[PDB]
Amino acid sequence: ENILNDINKRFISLPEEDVRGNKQILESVLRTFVEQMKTQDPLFKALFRRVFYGGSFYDGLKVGKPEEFDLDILLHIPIYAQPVLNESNVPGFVWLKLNNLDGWLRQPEGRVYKDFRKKFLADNDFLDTGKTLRWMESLVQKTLNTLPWVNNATCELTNEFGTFHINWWKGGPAMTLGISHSSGEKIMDVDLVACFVFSGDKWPINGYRSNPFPSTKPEFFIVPKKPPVNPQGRYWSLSFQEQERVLIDNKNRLKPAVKLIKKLKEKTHPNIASYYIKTVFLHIIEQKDQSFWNKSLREVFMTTLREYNEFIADQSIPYYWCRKNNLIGHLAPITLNNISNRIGYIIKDIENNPENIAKHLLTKEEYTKYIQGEDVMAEALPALPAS
Ligand SMILES: [Mn+2]
């Protein structure tokens, strides 16, 4: 009863000591950068509340060597300006307008918000995703220029863990910081995502699931990821990732089971996004008694794999927070039929033969190292590099 845990340790999960050490380094580099950002823009300093570290690495759900995560930079509009969040005509997306920005500007603390409308708002004082992204990109560029550069446009930052190199580029809506040890070893990429955070009173009700932790996780935020829709720039995504992280925590077999299924997905059906698997497990959490997660890893894996296949076969994975959004509604029936048939064959092949699981989860090259006793995760990303 250790086959699945052994596969996970040797071929799936970064050792937790290295997870923790890389997080301490990365979080310190980013605090230095965000503190410098505050020196470059009083409006950013006024808006800034906190950061949220987003992605599978920080959820404990990353398969293999971690490569990137999102720095969700949470900005807060003063409630005196009367922000109003409305559920949009596209399930899962919202609009945000301000009903009293002028009254806030007439307050003493509103002085630093003199350019907020110009920088962030479209017609009728709607928060605009494109304007927000352009504002953050400009601020990041301004900040990068004030840092010491070595080599060719490589920033050098120091902290209690040593000296680090920051490279940057824009491959999407948000700037990416590539963070490396000064000795050359790459650590991780970080996307700098400008978000707006709200208190529990603003939680959407029209077609949305209620907050499971309104006392201890009261806040949620909106993310400038658009769904063609009109009006352009008004549609914001909701992030309930802070609540999702609590839902998946303290559940023993759950995170190994998710990663085993994600490993299977990477090998046999990359057509399915990782968040769709995460979403299936949110539904399973809601359906199952809490004791389910204390069963054997084999039983949790086999049972959730079967239920995952039923979602795929049904061709519907409802967005956990707004059920009218089918996360796989855009995938073709033929594709989903083939993937469900694939998974059904795998279930039959491993049903009564747990020694066949590794044959389906691992590439042939990984399987050879598996049989030979190798551990490819032990040194996948040492927080203290060998140099
Ligand atoms: Mn339940």
Numbering used by the authors: 3 to 229, 232 to 391
Which sentences did the original study use to describe this structure?
Here we show that cGAS-like receptors (cGLRs) are innate immune sensors that are capable of recognizing divergent molecular patterns and catalysing synthesis of distinct nucleotide second messenger signals. In support of this conclusion, Hartmann, Imler, Cai and colleagues have identified cGLR2 as a second functional cGLR in Drosophila and have demonstrated in vivo that cGLR1 and cGLR2 have discrete roles in Drosophila immunity. Together, our results define cGLRs as receptors in animal cells that are capable of detecting diverse pathogen-associated molecular patterns and dictating response to the foreign environment.
To define the function of cGAS-like enzymes in animals, we screened predicted cGAS homologues for suitability in structural analysis and determined a 2.4 Å crystal structure of the human protein MB21D2 (hMB21D2; encoded by C3orf59) and a 1.6 Å crystal structure of a protein from the beetle species Tribolium castaneum (GenBank XP_969398.1). A conserved groove is present in both the hMB21D2 and the T. castaneum XP_969398.1 structures, but is notably distinguished by the absence of a Zn-ribbon and the insertion of a C-terminal α-helix in hMB21D2. In contrast to hMB21D2, the surface of T. castaneum XP_969398.1 shares highly conserved basic residues with human cGAS and we therefore tested this enzyme with candidate DNA and RNA ligands. We observed that T. castaneum XP_969398.1 is activated to synthesize a nucleotide product upon recognition of double-stranded RNA (dsRNA).
